[PDB]
Amino acid sequence: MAHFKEYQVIGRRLPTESVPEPKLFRMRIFASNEVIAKSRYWYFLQKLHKVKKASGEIVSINQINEAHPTKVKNFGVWVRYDSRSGTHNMYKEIRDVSRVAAVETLYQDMAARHRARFRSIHILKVAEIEKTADVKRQYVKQFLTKDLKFPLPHRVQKSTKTFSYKRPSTFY
Amino acid sequence: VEPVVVIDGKGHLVGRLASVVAKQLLNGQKIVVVRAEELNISGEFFRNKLKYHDFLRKATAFNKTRGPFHFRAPSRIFYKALRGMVSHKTARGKAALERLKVFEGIPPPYDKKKRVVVPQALRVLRLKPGRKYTTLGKLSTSVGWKYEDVVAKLEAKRKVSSAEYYAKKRAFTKKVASANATAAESDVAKQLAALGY
Amino acid sequence: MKYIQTEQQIEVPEGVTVSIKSRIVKVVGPRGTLTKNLKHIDVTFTKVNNQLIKVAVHNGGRKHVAALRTVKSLVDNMITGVTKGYKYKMRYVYAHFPINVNIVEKDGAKFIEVRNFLGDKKIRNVPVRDGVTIEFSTNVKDEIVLSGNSVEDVSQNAADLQQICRVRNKDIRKFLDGIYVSHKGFITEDL
Amino acid sequence: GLRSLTTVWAEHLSDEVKRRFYKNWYKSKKKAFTKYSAKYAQDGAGIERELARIKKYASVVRVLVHTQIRKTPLAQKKAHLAEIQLNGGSISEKVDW
Amino acid sequence: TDSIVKASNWRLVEVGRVVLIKKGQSAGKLAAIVEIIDQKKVLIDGPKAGVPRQAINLGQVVLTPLTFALPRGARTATVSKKWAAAAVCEKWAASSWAKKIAQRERRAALTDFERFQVMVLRKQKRYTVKKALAKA
RNA sequence: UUUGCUCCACACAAUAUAGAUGGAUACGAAUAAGGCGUCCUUGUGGCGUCGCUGAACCAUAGCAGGCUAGCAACGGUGCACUUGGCGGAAAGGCCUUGGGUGCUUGCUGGCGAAUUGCAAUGUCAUUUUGCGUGGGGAUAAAUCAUUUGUAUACGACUUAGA
RNA sequence: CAGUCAAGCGUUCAUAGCGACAUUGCUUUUUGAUUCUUCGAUGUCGGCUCUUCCUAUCAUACCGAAGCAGAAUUCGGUAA
RNA sequence: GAACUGGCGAUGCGGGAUGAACCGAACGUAGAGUUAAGGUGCCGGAAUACACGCUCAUCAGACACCACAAAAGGUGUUAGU
């Protein structure tokens, strides 16, 4: 959809004569902007409990960011993607620096490999990964071994002009 | 920048090469190309062939003569696809055909000056490690070109003559480099290395 | 999934030596030589310690990774064929018409003669490749041996004999008459 | 294709070949190869100039020759000329023959 | 007689190898590998230049055959701690790589008066080299 | 058929332009590799180096580029020749020798300009031709009228004839 | 015309060759459907004639299968 | 053959190669800047832009209206549950 950011939505339907101020909920949304996250709230909310954007409301809508935006981390994910047949449950484990960061790449991944749309992906829960060995994904295991050192063969360049008066080599 | 731009067809990509060439000639550039037989295609021997086969079966029903023209010359092969991306019908595209010139190998006047290349048009650069392709020299031969070893005999005499002159040139630059090093580290050498040269 | 690092290890039998530049090989030794072009796959090789050289791939697909294993396999068969060689056997099968084999040579072409292949009134021949030399097998009834450096020229010349005897318009299961390959080993004994 | 380089000749000819060139022969001056026989006055430095020029480059040999229609029962008198390829050994030794 | 299989020298991707940024907020600064993410993206960090510890693509930065000792996780402190503990600054401007840069860098900062000086000092430079390729 | 005609040194009018205005600046193969300098037993040999764009390199200061003195070297470039070698793919150009010769901005001088009055390309290119100059060289053919059958609706095809 | 699931038939085995109850397609050489087009005109049918194109290949050249022993046939493939 | 709203008839203009209708938009004659629908190697105007990957096809694919395509399989490869 766009570049991602993560927000924090808070609501309580609407207070009443009998019992005002209901339970009071919260959620962790991923939206490039504020209003985007307001729909995602009501999204799963009018799917689990009884409410709407007419019988209830939202108090706060602030953004939540990753504390250490310098360190690359591992991340596990809970997805409920709806195909041209139906809904299934898949488990991913991609290593990215920030949380909202791995979400943008896995969303791009859903279309380049899974062919599913923005309005076709379901995020259940994403518990960050702390321990190696508990690794069950193999594309992950290649970057988790000691002494990750490898040569970079074949080096192409970007031409600024229109010509070349030679025969440039491709070393790296 | 120069009166004419010389083009080396060896190691480039068929259609992408003509595209950039096209633009330059329509801007005001007279151009001559060489060794068009060495233009590299992609895919299998089998594929690229049959495409020319079905192109070979499409001709004016009632007049095979005043209709489609097929070619065995790797040079007018480049002429074909490149003219088909301009209007050879107006005086506009008519003058572009007259500026352009293509050759089967590197003829007499055109190998007494050097030819150039391009990265965004290079076969080697737009080819992923471990890919297939076909060359025009070999397929030009399978389509009906009776001039392979006739011209492979010409390139022999040629590559010998060009290397004999670079023998004298490689040794004459060994003279230029040993004269510039003995006159180096002087007063004008120090002052110039400071100005940026 | 572009396999990051996949690499195999290879042993050299002391006395043999191989020269290499680009993707071009050379196996010099006890019997002969074997030049080879590999500039159609695109891979790397590195000499580590005299009698040991490797092969590697960095970020290569499963078909390119199945090719790293496929060439370490090739490197192996070129070294043993130079020191031991490649010796195969083929027996002629018949039960009625005598299988006659000769050694012909017109102008110096070296072929093999097919006489009486099932009452054959036409003369069939078998072209001989370069490098490998044949020898008629005795002590045994209806056989012969091939001997050289590479498995290609020896067993493709053996596959020559194979399909040259085609039972056209007949029952293969019943009219089982022709030349088949019996033995597949080295020229040296014990191996 | 097959490109023709040098065209060589003889000194004296026949009127059959000289009239092969005229349309109006009953009114001609007969200036047929008059200056070509001037290449036969000089020792012949130019004759071998083109002859050995061919022994160096030219791949094949094809020679021109005219007919003997005077001994023939035909009143045309005009003898035709055509090229006949030489199938011998070495192109240099072919020019010699 | 032995084997001999070329050289096959390459720059290996690792924690401690430095690269040159061509585009971005820097577009001509230096930064070394702090951690590796995958195939095209890595983590840089170069304090002796003024650039941050940022996630970046390999298509926007180049390489160098310069590698010095570095811990797997070392933040800003240990980054230039081993930078100076290796002597990579003098080892960097010790090549024609960076001499090439300052050469055309000073050409884009040349006045026609100082560009005029290059022309004239070369009038006398080429004169002595012509009396050199005439007697030797 | 009035002195006609072809190449050159040229005398002027022209006629247009698919587009002048410092140099189109010449190994080969290879790119999961390579060029270059270098040594030896000249091997698919060892050692060092470069690339990340030709933003390279060479040339370039003067009335659109002048008159001319002196130093230093014996050199460079352009002009017209001379010696020899090479070049067949669409050679007709490239390589080199000897003299004559101008510049010599490689270093230091004497003088010239204006008003063209704050901008107006303010021309220093070349395709081709017509007509007068004088120095070499050459004395052309085809058509029809006529006849022929190897040709034909017709021209054409094809023979011949001072 | 071509399949596909495959109870079975096939002495014994579903798939040698076929294949019911079923289900997926293609075509405009069948007749239908339509009035879009033309009733101030496009000369109906067939035939004789002459040319070309398609392949859903009947035959030949090269080939695999069999309940192909010999022999022949039936199915299939590249190909007009 | 009917119900809704809208079009054309009676409508050019950019676009859909082009087409009565689909999208955008409706119109005096110019001049500038800004966007619509759609695109941007060349035709042909405009980045052979950057990004994350998928595919090698002995008849590839390559954007609504719309220009046709299905069952059913595959140890081709991929992420997988």
PDB file of C-alpha atoms in Angstrom, chain B residues 130-131, chain C residues 23 36-42:
ATOM      1  CA  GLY B 130      24.003 -18.785 -16.506  1.00  0.00           C
ATOM      2  CA  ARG B 131      21.634 -17.837 -19.365  1.00  0.00           C
TER       3      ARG B 131
ATOM      4  CA  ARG C  23      36.733 -22.100 -17.448  1.00  0.00           C
ATOM      5  CA  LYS C  36      37.593 -29.274 -21.439  1.00  0.00           C
ATOM      6  CA  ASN C  37      35.328 -26.226 -21.973  1.00  0.00           C
ATOM      7  CA  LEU C  38      32.970 -25.266 -19.104  1.00  0.00           C
ATOM      8  CA  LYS C  39      32.090 -21.710 -20.268  1.00  0.00           C
ATOM      9  CA  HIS C  40      28.418 -22.775 -20.623  1.00  0.00           C
ATOM     10  CA  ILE C  41      27.567 -23.252 -16.911  1.00  0.00           C
ATOM     11  CA  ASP C  42      29.551 -20.427 -15.149  1.00  0.00           C
TER      12      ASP C  42
END
